[PDB]
Amino acid sequence: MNIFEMLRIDEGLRLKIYKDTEGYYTIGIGHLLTKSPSLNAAKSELDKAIGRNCNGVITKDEAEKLFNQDVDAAVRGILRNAKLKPVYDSLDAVRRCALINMVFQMGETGVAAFTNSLRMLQQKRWDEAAVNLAKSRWYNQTPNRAKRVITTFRTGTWDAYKNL
């Protein structure tokens, strides 16, 4: 298991514009297009992203390309962030994947509100951090996904995904 297969499990793959759990226009493997209500605004963002007239539809290859870009941008974002970088540097390789997963779903900014949990992860207080992470909107809104990620930070193994 690696970051790509993990995210592919959590996000799925859709080749036509769809609405995410928050109701935002998305495409591919969790690629947010716009937070705007206009499907037209979304179609336009899509075409800008791909470089062709897509008419709300892309190919597998195009979805995978967007995905490579997003994972890369997620990592690069963590490395540039003063709050995130030190946590990331402190973690083992499996746990790093859990942090990248959160960033990909909620952005650098959203992850940064998890101040208290970030501190516990840094300190390697696994059980404590798992309990703190669960006290969030994130967990109440997407509990199955939150559980998989939390289990990953708790144990440092891929158990929560070997099921899947």
Swiss-Prot record:
The active site is at residues 11, 20. Changing residue 26 to H: Facilitates transglycosylation more effectively than hydrolysis; covalently bound substrate. The keyword Hydrolase applies. Changing residue 20 to E/Q: Loss of 99% of enzymatic activity. It is an enzyme of class 3 (hydrolase). One of its GO terms (molecular function) is lysozyme activity. Gene3D superfamilies: 1.10.530.40. The keyword Oxidoreductase does not apply. Its EC number is 3.2.1.17. It catalyses: Hydrolysis of (1->4)-beta-linkages between N-acetylmuramic acid and N-acetyl-D-glucosamine residues in a peptidoglycan and between N-acetyl-D-glucosamine residues in chitodextrins. Changing residue 20 to A/N/S/T: Complete loss of enzymatic activity. Changing residue 117 to V: 50-fold decrease in enzymatic activity. Changing residue 26 to E: Complete loss of activity at neutral pH; covalently bound substrate. Induction: Expressed late in the viral replication. Its main location: host cell. Transmembrane segments: none annotated. Substrate binds at residues 32, 104, 117, 132. Keywords: Antimicrobial, Bacteriolytic enzyme, Cytolysis, Glycosidase, Host cell lysis by virus, Host cytoplasm, Hydrolase, Viral release from host cell. PANTHER family: T4-TYPE LYSOZYME 1-RELATED. This is Endolysin. It comes from Enterobacteria phage T4. The gene is E.
